[PDB]
Write an enzyme that holds these catalytic residues in place. Structure first.
Site, short mmCIF file in Angstrom:
data_model
loop_
_atom_site.label_atom_id
_atom_site.label_comp_id
_atom_site.label_asym_id
_atom_site.label_seq_id
_atom_site.Cartn_x
_atom_site.Cartn_y
_atom_site.Cartn_z
CB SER A 92 26.30 34.75 12.94
OG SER A 92 24.94 34.56 13.32
CG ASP A 129 25.29 39.08 19.41
OD1 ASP A 129 23.97 38.87 19.35
OD2 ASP A 129 26.06 38.73 18.46
CG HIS A 172 24.05 38.69 15.93
ND1 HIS A 172 24.71 37.98 16.53
CD2 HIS A 172 23.68 38.00 14.70
CE1 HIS A 172 24.90 36.82 15.84
NE2 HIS A 172 24.36 36.94 14.54
#
Lengths: 369, 370
Positions: free
Chosen positions: B151, B316, B349
């Site tokens: 991320s 995600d 995510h």
């Protein structure tokens, strides 16, 4: 040219068991009611919408109603055959638009001379349905050839079909849902929280001149983006010349990127005639929604007798396609006559408002006979 | 165990051209640095993360570091072979956490004796990278066997590979991106707005016990949901007994659904040791991010020499897989040695933080290729 009309009820009992006095809602209709009143199609509107599904109120309106592409003479919803009617919801978001008539937090409480604010009773999808039903009854109508709507309108449409099974012959759900699941109820809460954080909200008791405009704009920024797609934002950014290392947000924590400025201004423009409390009440209506408003979705689906058509948008990030698939499969397993087709454009949720004519033929075929 | 360490820079120049004095960041490492200092793997952390990628500071810590499943002896990132090091970012979200050490709006400006607040210079992913580089240089390290992160950590990792190409032999991007595109920059802005609406924010100048707590909680509610999936929320709802027509929110506009009460409580628990201004600065760093911090993504990818591995998560909703596909395809079109594999779990995510071991073997064989 469309005439805006008004429907009034001196007394109304909400689904939550409370009283609303002197209900007034706007409505309009296209086409001609036949002698048996058997050709009525009710259009139910989306979260930020109104009764203005088609046509113009005045020649100089920049745009017609939002579904003008499929409502008209010879169109998929054919006004040469059908009486097409639509009704403003309670707590309509566009509370200060002169063409909208509604009842909700902005309405004046006679016992105080000020807006109800958050003293207004909680409203549900069912309450919108029941106001629509009272209007139809006042017109002598007792059955619907179809009920059709996108998004929050799809919620009203399928609740109609479940709550009043003998009233509804056909139900079309566009960019829709059979319930607000736990995901959707949480997702909608983020539309509400910015208003509750705005220092001018005053727990709902604000005056029009000191409204929570920043919180309302923040809500509309999130709504606007949730209803679109990465492709739309990135193409918009290309037109703006967006890039990551922009000098203003690099040099100043209080300045923003081009795309953020665009979205903020778009939201402020959308929100000009909207009311913040009404947004909170529409969020809550959606959060309480399940078709039929019984114990769960399966119970509500089991009551539906109408044949059903679902039209999700493949790229919808707001009411994702699985919500339409869920309702359609539930109905299929109960031997309901249920069909599902998809909008495939790249506007996401907004495909169902601005580009519904991409499935005009599915709608037309569904309404034939 | 793991010992938390501190790195200090008396003077630091930001990418925006400003000075920060008395920079302090926490760091930690696992494994043993070899004599050539040729076995260094840098872990770069995600938006709400820290240097604590593995292990425990105390045996009775309720949980080890967030990537403990893949960092350790014989694990996908094998600490019997590699020296695995990680560094707290500037403006770390966890400003009041007893182990995190950072420099940001909550820090005391030595010139005033008072917190910076929004006087703190804008920071970027590049600034995080440059602090890491200075720490590595202080340890006599001059090359990275790999840089790896999820991320926001993937942003640091790919910026490393672009900005300092000879430093980086290998780059792993998890649940990641090569840039914050217009969509992502707008999406991240909604994390900031609740804080700036909260009257207690006071244009950034709030005291610690008068913080914009409800704005911060609203931000963390949105962050929490954005990083998960409908599946997770609906399963959670089932455990809570979520119903559509719940009596409390039907009867009272000010009551909430079960799932909303759960999310609000989760957010406030997460935010206990966080700072609102730090969240604003991390949003801005992410919005300014493109690999290499040139004028577009292609220019940044053009300088990457490291072999690359991308691990998006199929479900995600926050950094969607197309961001990883875009960076990977840009690299393969330049004849970079690039590989992409996908996490298939239903946590969105969060697959990349809490379930990265689902692609442990892909990571291991990428790193172990003699």
């Amino acid at each position: 040219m469309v005439e805006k009309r008004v429907f009034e009820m001196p007394h109304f009992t909400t689904f939550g068991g409370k009283q609303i006095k002197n209900v007034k809602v706007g409505w309009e209709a296209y086409g001609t009611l036949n002698d048996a009143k058997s050709n009525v199609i009710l259009i139910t509107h989306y979260f930020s919408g109104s009764s203005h599904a088609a046509g113009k109120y005045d020649e100089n309106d920049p745009a017609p109603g939002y579904w003008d592409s499929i409502i008209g003479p010879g169109k998929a919803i054919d006004t040469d055959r059908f009486y097409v009617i639509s009704v403003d919801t309670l707590a309509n978001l566009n509370a200060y638009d002169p063409h909208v008539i509604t009842t909700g937090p902005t309405s004046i409480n006679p016992d105080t001379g000020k807006p109800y604010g958050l003293d207004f009773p909680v409203v549900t999808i069912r309450d919108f349905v029941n106001v629509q039903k009272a209007l139809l009854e006042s017109l002598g109508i007792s059955k619907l050839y179809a009920v059709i709507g996108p998004s929050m309108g799809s919620m009203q449409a399928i609740d109609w079909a479940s709550a009043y099974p003998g009233w509804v012959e056909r139900m079309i759900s566009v960019i829709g849902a059979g319930q607000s699941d736990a995901w959707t109820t949480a997702a909608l809460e983020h539309w509400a929280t910015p208003i509750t954080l705005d220092k001018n909200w005053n727990n709902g008791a604000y005056s029009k001149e000191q409204a929570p405009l920043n919180g309302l704009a923040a809500s509309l920024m999130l709504i606007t983006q949730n209803a679109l797609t990465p492709s739309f934002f990135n193409q918009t950014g290309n037109t703006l010349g967006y890039k990551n290392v922009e000098s203003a947000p690099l040099n100043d924590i209080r300045q923003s990127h081009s795309i953020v400025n665009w979205l903020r201004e778009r939201a402020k423009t959308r929100a000009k005639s909207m009311d913040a409390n009404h947004l909170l009440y529409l969020v809550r209506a959606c959060q309480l929604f399940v078709a039929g408003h019984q114990g769960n979705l399966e119970q509500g689906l089991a009551s539906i007798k109408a044949k059903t058509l679902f039209i999700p948008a493949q790229t919808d990030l707001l009411l994702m396609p699985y919500l339409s698939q869920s309702a359609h499969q539930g109905l299929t397993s109960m031997n309901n006559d249920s069909t599902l087709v998809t909008l495939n454009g790249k506007l996401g949720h907004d495909e169902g408002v601005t580009n519904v004519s991409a499935q005009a033929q599915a709608i037309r075929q569904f309404l034939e006979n």
